[PDB]
Amino acid sequence: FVNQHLCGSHLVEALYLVCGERGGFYVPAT
Amino acid sequence: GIVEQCCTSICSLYQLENYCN
């Protein structure tokens, strides 16, 4: 992880890498 | 507001975790 501008699916990816991989996710399936 | 925090400005894993909680 590196701090940068993040949006859309790239934002969701960042949230997944930091916390979705800890099981803490609400998964916006689309 | 995750969009205003990350799309608009620079954000980091530290803030991203608050949207996980």
Swiss-Prot record, chain B:
Superkingdom of origin = Eukaryota
Q: Which cysteines are joined by disulfide bonds?
A: 6-11
Q: What is this protein called?
A: Insulin A chain
The record lists the lineage as:
Eukaryota, Metazoa, Chordata, Craniata, Vertebrata
Q: In terms of the whole protein, what range is present?
A: 90 to 110 of 110
